[PDB]
Amino acid sequence: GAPATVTEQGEDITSKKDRGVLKIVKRVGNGEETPMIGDKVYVHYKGKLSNGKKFDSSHDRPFVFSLGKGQVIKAWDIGVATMKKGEIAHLLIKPEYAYGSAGSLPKIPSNATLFFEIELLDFKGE
Numbered sequence: 604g605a606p607a608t609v610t611e612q613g614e615d616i617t618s619k620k621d622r623g624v625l626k627i628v629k630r631v632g633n634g635e636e637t638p639m640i641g642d643k644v645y646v647h648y649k650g651k652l653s654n655g656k657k658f659d660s661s662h663d664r665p666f667v668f669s670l671g672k673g674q675v676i677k678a679w680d681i682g683v684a685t686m687k688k689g690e691i692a693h694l695l696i697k698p699e700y701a702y703g704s705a706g707s708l709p710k711i712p713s714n715a716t717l718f719f720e721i722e723l724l725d726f727k728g729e
């Protein structure tokens with residue numbers, strides 16, 4: 604399903620063009636602005652290992668973070684910076700842009716590919 608669709612059709616939004624972060628816009632957002640680095644960002648997300656085997660969501664209980672400030676994995680700083688208010692996007696992320704060969708046990712194993720659906724609710728300029 605969704606992870607394989609992002610493999611097949613997703614845009615490579617990396618600078619290096621290494622397919623490390625692939626994106627599909629699922630629902631289009633409003634406004635020309637996207638978050639600049641330093642912004643306070645508000646999202647709903649659903650995430651999982653691409654294997655399907657572990658699963659994690661804000662809409663369970665929004666997730667708040669400062670963009671570009673190392674509170675989230677590199678792929679979120681990259682991916683969320685491309686998104687507009689109201690946008691829902693799918694990301695598929697190689698380990699180099701997430702938790703790498705070290706992983707982050709017990710939640711994330713070594714060399715894990717991650718999938719997220721993200722909704723950008725708001726962002727405000729520090």
Ligand SMILES: COc1cc2cc(c1OC)OCC[C@H](C)n1cc(nn1)CCCOC(=O)[C@@H]1CCCCN1C(=O)[C@H]2C1CCCCC1
Nearest residue numbers: 648650651652657658659666674675676679707710711717
């Ligand atoms: C590697 O550890 C975790 C990874 C992820 C979720 C984690 C987590 O903690 C063990 O618990 C979610 C709730 C806790 C209190 N928490 C942690 C963070 N923010 N809230 C810190 C953010 C670190 O996570 C990230 O950078 C990314 C992007 C933002 C949303 C969470 N992220 C994750 O990688 C999840 C992960 C998704 C894949 C399935 C397992 C959970």
